[PDB]
Amino acid sequence: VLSPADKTNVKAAWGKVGAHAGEYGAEALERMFLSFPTTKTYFPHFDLSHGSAQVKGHGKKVADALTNAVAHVDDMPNALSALSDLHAHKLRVDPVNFKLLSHCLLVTLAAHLPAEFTPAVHASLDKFLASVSTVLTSKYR
Template sequence: MERMQGEGEVDHLERPSPLTDKERVILQDSWAKVYQNCDDVGVAILIRLFVNFPSSKQYFSNFKNIERPEELEKSAQLRNHARRVMNSINTLVENLENTDKVASVLKMLGKGHALRHKVEPIYFKILGGVILEVLGEEFPEVVTAEVAEAWTKLLATLYFGITTTYDEVGWSKLSTATG
């Protein structure tokens, strides 16, 4: 397994500045276009993640041994997980003006991935980069520089929220105890 810088540790980041009203509108408008193709986009995101960062597959017993992207694409389990990822993003984007709801969703995602699935937090940062890359390639007419900037800020906010939860559940102690 390739070792990633900072593995086992949670980045201690500064909280990103809150989204502006304009950024929320930009995110919701661009997401509405993306979400129309949520199944295909979700699968493209996960396949890109697994191809470019093969160590990320270790957390998925159902398809961690599938090597070829074509086979991954056919996996019902991968498609189901892709839909869950896209639905979670959709919930977050739909509720951008409700900071309590966003915080609640991020806390739930963080706790589940830290305690139940034992996913290293760095993978959320990696996933954010993959999401931005795939959206830019699949929707070049939608993801302008201004839209990409808003998504970058949102993904940083999501990563901050999830890693904060990792801190709250004692991730650094958990990962050294189980590693």
């Protein structure tokens, strides 16, 4: 579970992302597609090249969903209800891929937060992303 300290840590780090949210979501996606090419199997309808509109647009959607999760950190299952439905019933992404994107999101944050990405904040962000991932796969079966 996310401790008060975790929630404080996440809110501070994600708060520094701010308007860079969409950019960082797209970058994390690119990192994932390059580092873990099997994740591309979920996006055959995408042009996956660097700079592409579909990746930029999807990056903003992922980031905004994270912003929503942060805004409702005490009740993420409810806040993310439509999204967990969508992943369980339609998108049907294998759960391991959430670990891949989570890591790539951490790497992206690390690469953009030289000051904020302390060991304690790293730990809290990783817990947060695992929590989001758990909620997003909570209706799979």
